[PDB]
Amino acid sequence: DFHFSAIFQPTDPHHHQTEFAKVEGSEKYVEEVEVFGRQALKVNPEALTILAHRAFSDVHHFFRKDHLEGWRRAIEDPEASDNDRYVATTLLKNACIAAGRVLPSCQDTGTAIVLGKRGELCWTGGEDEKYLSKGIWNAYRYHNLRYSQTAALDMFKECNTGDNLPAQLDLLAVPGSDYEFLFIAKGGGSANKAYLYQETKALLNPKSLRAFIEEKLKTLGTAACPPYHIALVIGGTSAEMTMKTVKLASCRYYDSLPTTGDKYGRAFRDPEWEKIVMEVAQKSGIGAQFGGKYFAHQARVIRLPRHGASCPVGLAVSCSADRQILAHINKSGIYIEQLEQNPAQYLPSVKVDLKRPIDKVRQQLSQYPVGTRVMLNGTLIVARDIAHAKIKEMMDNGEPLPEYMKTSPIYYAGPAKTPEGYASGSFGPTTAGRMDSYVDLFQSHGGSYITLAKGNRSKQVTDACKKHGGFYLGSIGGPAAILAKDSIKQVTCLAFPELGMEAVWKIEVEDFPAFIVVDDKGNDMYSKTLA
Amino acid sequence: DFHFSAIFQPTDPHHHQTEFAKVEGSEKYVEEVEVFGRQALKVNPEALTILAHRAFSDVHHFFRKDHLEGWRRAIEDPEASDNDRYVATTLLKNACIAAGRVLPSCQDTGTAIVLGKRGELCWTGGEDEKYLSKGIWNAYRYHNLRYSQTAALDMFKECNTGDNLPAQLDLLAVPGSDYEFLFIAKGGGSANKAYLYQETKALLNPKSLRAFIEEKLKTLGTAACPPYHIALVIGGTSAEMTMKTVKLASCRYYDSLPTTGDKYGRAFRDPEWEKIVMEVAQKSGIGAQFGGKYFAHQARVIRLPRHGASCPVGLAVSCSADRQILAHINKSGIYIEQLEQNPAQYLPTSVKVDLKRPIDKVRQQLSQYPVGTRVMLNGTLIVARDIAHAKIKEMMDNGEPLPEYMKTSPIYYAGPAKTPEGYASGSFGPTTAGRMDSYVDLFQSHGGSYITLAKGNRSKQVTDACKKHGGFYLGSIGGPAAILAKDSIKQVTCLAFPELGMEAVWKIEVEDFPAFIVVDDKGNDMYSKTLA
Ligand SMILES: O=C(O)C[C@H](S)C(=O)O
Ligand SMILES: O=C(O)C[C@H](S)C(=O)O
Ligand code: SF4
Ligand code: SF4
């Protein structure tokens, strides 16, 4: 009566649908052997270093076809909004610059995540975590990436690790003699849009589930740089299993799952509800960041078994910095997924002078409604999470709001490392909502009247800008390389240099595009689509 | 220069602080060999079946010392409330019954979870998932446990799998030649109290974090049968990593982590904030289910590294059915954690309600008493939980009446485990009440569900419904399923929907069934102050 049924039964478990290139000469790192009658593979652990280094180098300069096709679709679709096409064109042009292998596609080169599947008879010497980490360390140290990891010295005292370690190393024990991998360079803001809901049987009917999807999609907002790859997981054997599954779904790792369930509880993709998710995304009007049809590239919906008392639900996105790369080691060597190296084949405003007293800039912005495109020319002061927290603490101790918060628009951003001979490394915006708790306070103390970042913000920011005569400008989210190449002319560290990329910067910019998202009158570009 | 630092650096990675018993004769399943100069272990995969079967048998009848000590503390502490002592005594007596190896400690024998760590040179043949699953299958099939897993035939059509499979099998590749395990029989309602928050640097100061903890602990309520082992994880490299870590923390798997961080971002346990979590839990007044000090047994707080843009936070509990067991396979055979076989060593006023009356007379009697009154129920209960409620609502949406069997007796939210030979009932404690909240006003408007019996605090809509319709919600003690079955449940019959398995509608006869009036017919709620 016993019948074993694996929860996940992909028809393409080894991802034969993906194209791989072999690392030249890498057969020297492997040797097929036969031990106690079974075929085994000896793997020099240096192969893990070589592989992780190339994976976390390639993934920052190239994209998958399904991602690039989505941007082209947003440009060519007659039903796309003007802003849809503008954002998608900008992101495609950014990808063309990133393909030069100098500037990464996003300033947030992400957390390094490794999903590894080591066969029973794949023998590495066992130090896999160290050798993978060395390859990751090499990639972030010797390329123009960013150190984004924050170590906790105690509960509240933190420092940057200075090398983008530690990585997340999830190494699984599986049958066979190969070693199979998924490498993910996961952006922080898209990682933040991984949500867990604890639901019930009352959700599991067509009307309730549709309404749930409509409600939860809006909570993604534009804070993770859409168009999104949207993943939705209904059910699971635990919260952590649901959230792992929705991460992998967003990487299209489970595309080959069955599409029907059975009495043993196997996982399945649900194409009918993927289409419903896409209908909700298109009809939302949220669009590719600034209103339209292209909130989502595509959708993945996976239905999982559940304890009768339980219904965990996971929702997650892959952002414009859609960065994953499959790989495997076998008796022939090291194979790595081939990304698109020629993204160019997929391609088919009010001037604001910042070199003035800030009150004159505010006066000019007050002449325009939300949704107006602007082009900024002049100085920006750059500050994000830790700098804002340190400045609030200073004011709580009776110190003034610093002069540099009162002279220029505040750009929420943290740069990647500067290539030799370049004025700036990749340097796109940070999610604005994380700074919302500071805006009324800083404006009440005479600063932060104009902020520049990406993503929709909470009502407290709209209220603050109306009370204090402020503005929130939305940069396009994601196009960090083209912003650096074309707009950023000078970069200087202003304060808190120990914070690394989170230091306060002073930058000089030209032709920096943005939209007026929140004005000084109570209006919000997102008030209709993200209410 | 490059310096590798593992995130997790326990000082006791093989859990030497835990006592293990050897499975007699199990060295016959292993053989030490040497290939390419390296020591390897051949393991007969039948060892995986034997180990999983014993693990998911033992864990339903015995508890760890730190769990039992927590119940004893709630009895002996002068600061414990009278209800704290009553609940902890009931749970200890339940454990004494479960130690008889016939009735499981809870009717929810849980989801079977296996965390495995297979050494590079531990050679099983590779069919680990099947052989582990067979042992789990054996444990749930041939013992008086419960089939709790629900398969999705399509997005909405469901059926019970009938064997408590599939299991969650997380098998990791690690150094060496051994095989190490943590087995968890995870209750559904405590699994539901695993929460993920997406926070920011603005949280990471003493005032904000303390207020956050106070707010979020209240959202656990009593819905997962406290006293809780409370686990809190601040940070993490991804949502799924944070939630895995908070699960393992609640199982005390990370107790030997360092207690300080470093510039490489290693994880650490934070004893100062564990003490703060315990102070918040104690001062909340929520107590061991019915007001008092013993909301929590103990706390685990793990601080993790984070991307500068990110601060995932995990909060989770282990419930009264605190069920995990460590194990390992090595050159000497199969070893399994030794749980406490003699829980009795930890052991040191009510209104009688006759349910064998017209339901309106029972309502009239209950209306005489305030919330917090302890009652003892004698008579018939109609038993229905999530799927039966959904099916009955669907019938009503299609124009059918509320069934008469929903109008004659109080409704007990519960699903029984299998009945031992010669017993009137298997373990048969209550289901979480909150999951049925959306049905109460509707059913009461149609003349039924005026009195409900379950565990956990409920939402405001239920308080409002009971005031509008002259209803009551009675809180059973949560967790003591074996002593309820042994002493209180006298007859069990299936009344409707037999295809739902444990989720069928049952008609049961009970005696001396304890409960508290949680919501009355006047707008009052026993939890309105502690869980406001
Ligand atoms: O770290 C970054 O630069 C981008 C992320 S998405 C953020 O700040 O929200
Ligand atoms: O399944 C059970 O019997 C107990 C769980 S905790 C529940 O239903 O709330
Ligand atoms: S594309 Fe946007 S969300 Fe994604 S990593 Fe870059 S800034 Fe963050
Ligand atoms: S003790 Fe309570 S929460 Fe835990 S499994 Fe049993 S009924 Fe569910």
Swiss-Prot record, chain A:
One of its GO terms (biological process) is malate metabolic process. Its EC number is 4.2.1.2. Binds 1 [4Fe-4S] cluster per subunit. It comes from the Eukaryota. It catalyses: (S)-malate = fumarate + H2O. Its main location: cytoplasm. InterPro entries: Class-I_Fumarase/Tartrate_DH, Fe-S_hydro-lyase_TtdA-typ_cat, Fe-S_hydro-lyase_TtdB-typ_cat, Fe-S_hydroAse_TtdB_cat_sf, Fe_dep_fumarate_hydratase. Pfam families: Fumerase, Fumerase_C. Homodimer. Belongs to the class-I fumarase family. This is Fumarate hydratase 2. It comes from Leishmania major. The gene is FH2.
Curated annotation (Swiss-Prot), chain B:
(S)-malate 1 binds at Q107, D108, R146, G189, R385, T431, T432, A433, G434, R435, K455. Its cofactor is [4Fe-4S] cluster. InterPro entries: Class-I_Fumarase/Tartrate_DH, Fe-S_hydro-lyase_TtdA-typ_cat, Fe-S_hydro-lyase_TtdB-typ_cat, Fe-S_hydroAse_TtdB_cat_sf, Fe_dep_fumarate_hydratase. It catalyses: (S)-malate = fumarate + H2O. Its EC number is 4.2.1.2. One of its GO terms (biological process) is fumarate metabolic process. The keyword Cell wall biogenesis/degradation does not apply. Pfam families: Fumerase, Fumerase_C. It is an enzyme of class 4 (lyase). The keyword Methyltransferase does not apply. Keywords: 4Fe-4S, Cytoplasm, Iron, Iron-sulfur, Lyase, Metal-binding. Optimum pH is 9. (S)-malate 2 binds at N192, K193, A194, Y195, L196, Y197, Q198. It is found in: Cytoplasm, Cytosol. [4Fe-4S] cluster binds at C106, C225, C319. GO terms for molecular function: 4 iron, 4 sulfur cluster binding; fumarate hydratase activity; metal ion binding; protein homodimerization activity. GO terms for cellular component: ciliary plasm; cytoplasm; cytosol; glycosome. Cytosolic fumarate hydratase that catalyzes the reversible hydration of fumarate to (S)-malate. Belongs to the class-I fumarase family. Homodimer. This is Fumarate hydratase 2. The lineage of its organism: Eukaryota, Discoba, Euglenozoa, Kinetoplastea, Metakinetoplastina.
